[PDB]
Amino acid sequence: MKFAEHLSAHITPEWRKQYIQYEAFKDMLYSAQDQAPTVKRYFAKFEEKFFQTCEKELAKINTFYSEKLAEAQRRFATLQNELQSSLDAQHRNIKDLKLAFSEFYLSLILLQNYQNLNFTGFRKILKKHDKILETSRGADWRVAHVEVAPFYTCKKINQLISETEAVVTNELEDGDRQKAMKRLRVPPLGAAQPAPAWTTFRVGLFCGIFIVLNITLVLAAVFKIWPLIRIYRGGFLLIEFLFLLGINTYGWRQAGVNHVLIFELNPRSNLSHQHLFEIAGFLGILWCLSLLACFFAPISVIPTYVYPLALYGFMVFFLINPTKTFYYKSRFWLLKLLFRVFTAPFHKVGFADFWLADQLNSLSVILMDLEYMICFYSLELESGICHKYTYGVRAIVQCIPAWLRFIQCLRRYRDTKRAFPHLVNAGKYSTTFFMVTFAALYSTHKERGHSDTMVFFYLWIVFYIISSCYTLIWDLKMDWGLFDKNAGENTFLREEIVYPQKAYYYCAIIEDVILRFAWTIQISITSTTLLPHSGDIIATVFAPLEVFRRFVWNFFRLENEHLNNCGEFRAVRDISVA
Amino acid sequence: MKFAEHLSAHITPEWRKQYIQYEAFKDMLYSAQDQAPTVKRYFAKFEEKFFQTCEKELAKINTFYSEKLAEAQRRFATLQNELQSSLDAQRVQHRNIKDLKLAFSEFYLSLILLQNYQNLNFTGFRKILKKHDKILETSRGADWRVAHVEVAPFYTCKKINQLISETEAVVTNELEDGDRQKAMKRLRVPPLGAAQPAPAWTTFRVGLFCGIFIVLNITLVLAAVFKIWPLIRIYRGGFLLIEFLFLLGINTYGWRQAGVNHVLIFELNPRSNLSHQHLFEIAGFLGILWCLSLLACFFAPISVIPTYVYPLALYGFMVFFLINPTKTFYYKSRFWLLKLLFRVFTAPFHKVGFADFWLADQLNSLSVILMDLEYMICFYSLELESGICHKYTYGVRAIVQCIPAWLRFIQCLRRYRDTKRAFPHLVNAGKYSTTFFMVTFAALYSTHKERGHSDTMVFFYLWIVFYIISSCYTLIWDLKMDWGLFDKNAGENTFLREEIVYPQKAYYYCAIIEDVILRFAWTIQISITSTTLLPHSGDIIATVFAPLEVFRRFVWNFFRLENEHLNNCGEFRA
Ligand SMILES: CCCCC/C=C\C/C=C\CCCCCCCC(=O)O[C@H](COC(=O)CCCCCCCCCCCCCCC)COP(=O)([O-])OCC[N+](C)(C)C
Ligand SMILES: CCCCC/C=C\C/C=C\CCCCCCCC(=O)O[C@H](COC(=O)CCCCCCCCCCCCCCC)COP(=O)([O-])OCC[N+](C)(C)C
Ligand SMILES: O=P(O)(O)O[C@@H]1[C@@H](OP(=O)(O)O)[C@H](OP(=O)(O)OP(=O)(O)O)[C@@H](OP(=O)(O)O)[C@H](OP(=O)(O)OP(=O)(O)O)[C@@H]1OP(=O)(O)O
Ligand SMILES: O=P(O)(O)O[C@@H]1[C@@H](OP(=O)(O)O)[C@H](OP(=O)(O)OP(=O)(O)O)[C@@H](OP(=O)(O)O)[C@H](OP(=O)(O)OP(=O)(O)O)[C@@H]1OP(=O)(O)O
Ligand SMILES: O=P(O)(O)O[C@@H]1[C@@H](OP(=O)(O)O)[C@H](OP(=O)(O)OP(=O)(O)O)[C@@H](OP(=O)(O)O)[C@H](OP(=O)(O)OP(=O)(O)O)[C@@H]1OP(=O)(O)O
Ligand SMILES: O=P(O)(O)O[C@@H]1[C@@H](OP(=O)(O)O)[C@H](OP(=O)(O)OP(=O)(O)O)[C@@H](OP(=O)(O)O)[C@H](OP(=O)(O)OP(=O)(O)O)[C@@H]1OP(=O)(O)O
Ligand SMILES: CC(C)CCC[C@@H](C)[C@H]1CC[C@H]2[C@@H]3CC=C4C[C@@H](O)CC[C@]4(C)[C@H]3CC[C@]12C
């Protein structure tokens, strides 16, 4: 029943081009039926063409299966040699060995699913051809060729799988088959894994509560001592980022972008997009409750300043919660990633590290708000001293994410030794640093006229232009891999696009072009006191736009990275054991 | 992976005892492995016992499959004969061909169910034998599977397959003018039971509506605590409707979890049946609208818009949500609800089925809605003495209260006329007529309480005696003729029937106690609402009791459906 959708949902993305072209065969059959009027010879010629195409596709599948089987055999030999060496040596090495064996087992299961799905598609398409042509020649062809093809008659995959299970359960699990077959089981993968009903119900309940509380907050603020906007902007931006990240995960899963492999996550257990949605909904519920408490102040004895403190403390505890509950695995992974990012020079820069550093760079408003709150607590508790003046530490705090990204680029240059990409990327962060420094200098000289304020203004404008152009060019050319000379039909894009619509690509181009300038203006204003009157409003309005731009950029960067992965037909992590 | 859960979910409840008892073999194997200590002799004895049990189960499956194959062949022959007769016969013909199409679809579904039975039994046998081989570290379970399971009549008979093929051919050739696609659009059998999870969007919408409803209720309580028309008497009807929909969604979920084939009992379509999730969604949306209307009444932000429009609109929309001609929102279940309502409100002119009686009982548990509609009409007619409609009783009020009881009584009379079985329908008619007697005597007492007739006490005593009579009648029929409890064959289900499908008997005992208490409360509430009686606290007591009546009817739906599935209490099937 509707094998096309099943194949599309179950196809391994990295091997998408190597599967049965079921939709193409359906289109050919329908076109032949429509163009049918001498009729017998026309049908015979169409059948000959169909059989030639089927032979070509079968040869393609056979070749790909042979290459992947050879790769699996080589990986098995290497893993066996490494296991023998480790046994001869006889903690972290054993853990890496288990991870590598699990990855190899996943690869074997993926190849087995590839072969099974290809056979099923062959059978289904041949049956459909027989039904359309009212002839049984398709079944005869299937028996003659499809059922005798090497990709089917080759049972090496199953025996290799069994040998892997035996090795894992004997030499790694101490002869226990219960501990084995659990690390390596390969449950349903891709987009064919429905989420729990209770999770969806919780997502909906949280979304509804958040919507009602937002409506109530708007109504109260329109109908009814501490800067609430500055305090709560960070939380609002975090909730919006989590929601858009859930959307990003959903889109990656739908479009086949294997972010699981890109982020080096666990293929067997993953956090679904609805989990992110429910986390965002719960955090938004807490944020709205805190804001409503601040507005109405229900508990008179309890002051108004403790509500945001409790909200943020609960958020921090939830992220840090040592107990093995509330997505403890994902939270620990995120904590490790954050530790690696904030200490970038001392760890190798993987895709996850740079990606999270970019996310933080798009969320610098949270750090700015935290620093402003610290300043307000230290000094205010001259009205508005923190807002009326800017200092060097403010600029350093603003550039901290840019510093992290720049030093990550430097570390990547040191490791890979390739100069062009890493140095150019480190150059964009350098133009970002030069911008904030010049803005801060201009703001400092404005109050204390040093007679060089206009020179600094001109320099800041120039560097603003340079930084905006640098970031936009890097986003559209390198991060998104667009504007490539290899694109024939996809003008202003690359040869292969994973997402269905090119209009989406064009809209993303336009929105990124506008929002890069918007974000540059927002950061320049926030980092200093250029616009002391309305600057807070501009920053508040622009920060959600920055998060939206980061969300689109995540979409397209992950798409480009997934396309690069597809180029090498790499569907599993490369695990090296020390 | 976990075949036990998959089997339990995919078992057809009607044939539940007829499937391989995977759990029994699991427990037997686990106990044998746990009690193992000489050792070879014990292992051989256990193997002999296990294979004897396997052979017994295989023979059971074979006999059941033979019985069902014979039944399928008989049904196919009868349907083919009926189709031949219909073809030779050629408004009445249109209905005949429609009924033949429906019967062919039902027979195809039965064939698909038998095929699924075959496949599931074979899979379970193979998996349990594989587990036995793994536990006993031997290669004998597979040998026995090949020797017996793989050559057994149930697994070696392809008769059912050609039966399905012949059914498809016959349908496509004699009921669709040769169109395969049209025939398959109705013959195709999607997964049944818990096999198909509800749509993700459906669950998300249910949760969204639940959250919106909860927050709106909190806001409504806060507004009422802090902050021309009786809001209680105008909104309790909608509140009761929402509560009834929510509890009916719970009832559907419990029926699906307990293996009660309510689809067959209500004669619904097995290929596409409304689930508890949709009922929860509808209840949540209606609750959102109700809360918004009541918030508007409490606040009345818009001044040009009067307050009285807010209730009306809501109810109006509810009407527009049930009589919507377009095929937009639950059209297939709304039209089936409209036809059932038309049949119930015209009871004496239709063959009373299970759906009609069930909906009439639901209305008997939702008479407060009709009473409040009549009270709103009274308020509009006269009040708009101030409370002239609350301070008096009239025959219209009594007949409005009795309407559901009148419908049930006429349904029972029609059932007696058709089936010709005196006892059940006549006793039910007397049970429903006790309601007429109680209501009319209460109305007379209230009417005479205003003037010194000197007959107030005799009428009060008659009302008390008939109240007791009606309460006892209703309770006894609920506990002995609806739930089928207090049966003589209570070997280990004391105070219950021989066989019970719900997990716990504590549920049954709590249900009995709740049924008694809430039947008394319902009778008292009908007495309060039908007349003046209490002139001050009547409204509050009625409002408090009506949700209890809805809950009691919800538990009654549970147990009535259970007894119907287990026994033909209503005699609605051959
Ligand atoms: C001040 C800076 C604020 C923090 C910075 C902003 C956001 C950080 C959160 C998430 C970004 C990471 C997203 C990864 C992208 C892949 C998609 C995915 O979500 O994939 C997930 C992993 O990722 C996540 O679940 C991310 C965790 C999100 C939890 C939410 C915590 C929020 C805490 C709020 C902070 C409060 C601060 C106070 C405010 C002043 C795959 O799931 P798995 O279970 O296979 O995970 C892997 C686990 N193995 C490897 C063992 C299987
Ligand atoms: C005193 C005033 C009025 C009181 C309230 C009146 C009626 C509501 C009561 C019951 C509703 C039916 C319950 C179904 C029980 C069987 C189990 C099941 O779940 O069966 C459902 C039947 O779904 C229903 O009927 C609809 C459920 C209820 C939806 C509510 C719609 C809006 C109503 C507005 C209220 C109107 C008054 C205005 C307010 C003053 C299975 O659906 P299917 O699609 O298989 O249907 C079969 C369709 N084939 C046979 C063609 C495939
Ligand atoms: O009866 P019909 O005509 O409505 O459906 C037929 C056919 O569709 P057709 O009309 O030719 O275009 C198949 O493709 P389709 O439309 O679903 O696929 P697309 O997604 O559009 O590619 C369908 O599913 P499947 O074979 O692809 O999985 C299959 O159903 P089913 O009994 O489950 O077959 P099995 O899976 O058990 O073999 C039927 O095959 P017949 O035995 O030849 O009648
Ligand atoms: O297999 P590892 O050793 O590489 O990793 C496992 C190891 O901890 P590690 O990470 O190495 O520090 C286990 O403890 P350990 O060293 O005493 O002994 P083992 O050799 O595992 O028997 C721990 O508890 P346990 O589950 O096994 O009882 C388990 O927790 P986890 O499944 O998260 O969660 P829970 O089920 O505990 O709640 C880890 O599984 P993963 O992190 O998913 O790989
Ligand atoms: O845990 P492991 O990995 O060491 O052994 C598991 C394995 O047994 P295996 O060696 O092939 O015989 C599964 O087979 P599988 O899915 O690959 O099947 P196929 O070959 O593809 O058909 C079997 O599932 P299954 O038989 O119900 O389908 C599963 O049964 P379990 O969950 O108990 O569920 P129950 O049936 O008892 O309810 C076993 O779990 P455990 O015995 O609890 O440890
Ligand atoms: O269930 P039933 O068979 O007892 O009654 C069906 C019948 O309605 P009636 O009582 O005569 O007014 C159909 O019209 P009809 O006589 O021309 O003939 P057919 O039964 O089709 O031969 C109608 O299709 P429509 O003409 O409006 O599209 C269809 O509704 P609806 O789902 O919208 O139909 P679809 O979108 O699935 O096609 C009804 O349910 P179902 O067939 O199960 O679907
Ligand atoms: C601001 C103006 C000029 C342009 C706005 C365009 C926005 C709405 C566009 C830019 C990129 C687009 C996204 C690109 C990719 C996907 C993945 C797909 O599986 C679901 C839709 C989704 C998530 C798109 C939604 C619409 C989107 C966010």
Ligand SMILES: CC(C)CCC[C@@H](C)[C@H]1CC[C@H]2[C@@H]3CC=C4C[C@@H](O)CC[C@]4(C)[C@H]3CC[C@]12C
């Ligand atoms: C406080 C007392 C008197 C009230 C009566 C007890 C109530 C709570 C009892 C009566 C009947 C019971 C239901 C009977 C059957 C089922 C189906 C089962 O699959 C889940 C539980 C569920 C849904 C029960 C929930 C509890 C229930 C509603």
